């Protein structure tokens, strides 16, 4: 009906490359920055799949929006300074910068800056002290990529699994 048989397929798997792309770019960090990297036990204590497609997705693109990512820092901080104190407005912000990402079109690099803001905003709401909210963002982050026609662009392109050839 409302959704293509992959289009739907790439909606339910954005949970999963989230999940993944949380914990791998976590992880990164820890690895590279040790304790001068940003703590959080509940990026550390997310269980993955044994090494699944839609795993080895998610720690590409988190690989890749190490790098690519950084150019959107300052406008993703700027923006989380809007949230407020119960994050009752994560969901609305998360809408503004998917607004924002692609007002010009979908790209590849477009969705790795979302997933990004996702990651960040995970990050600032534990920082702030609400706990176990990494549940919501990723409701939050699938939602906007299903009803913004995301999943039906990526659909198009062979589906989540088409992300693994720019390693």
Do not use: C
């Not at 959080?40 to 998610?58: A, R």
């Not at 176990?132 to 062979?158: C, E, M, N, P």
Request: no cysteine; aromatic share 12%; charged share 15%.
């Amino acid at each position: 009906g409302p959704l293509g048989s992959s289009e739907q397929q790439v909606a339910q798997d954005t949970e999963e490359v989230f999940r993944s792309y949380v914990f791998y770019l976590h992880q990164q960090e820890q690895e590279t920055q040790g304790a001068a990297a940003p703590a959080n036990p509940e990026m550390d204590n997310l269980p993955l799949e044994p090494n699944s497609i839609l795993g080895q997705v998610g720690r590409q693109l988190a690989l890749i929006g190490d790098d690519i990512n950084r150019r959107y820092d300052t406008e993703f901080q700027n923006l989380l300074e809007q949230l407020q104190p119960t994050a009752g407005n994560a969901y609305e912000l998360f809408t503004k910068i998917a607004s924002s990402l692609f007002k010009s079109g979908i790209s590849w690099g477009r969705v790795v800056a979302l997933l990004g803001f996702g990651y960040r905003l995970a990050l600032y709401v534990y920082q702030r002290g609400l706990t176990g909210f990494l549940g919501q963002v990723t409701s939050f982050l699938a939602d906007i990529i299903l009803h913004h026609y995301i999943a039906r662009w990526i659909a198009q392109r062979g589906g989540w699994v088409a992300a693994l050839n720019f390693r």
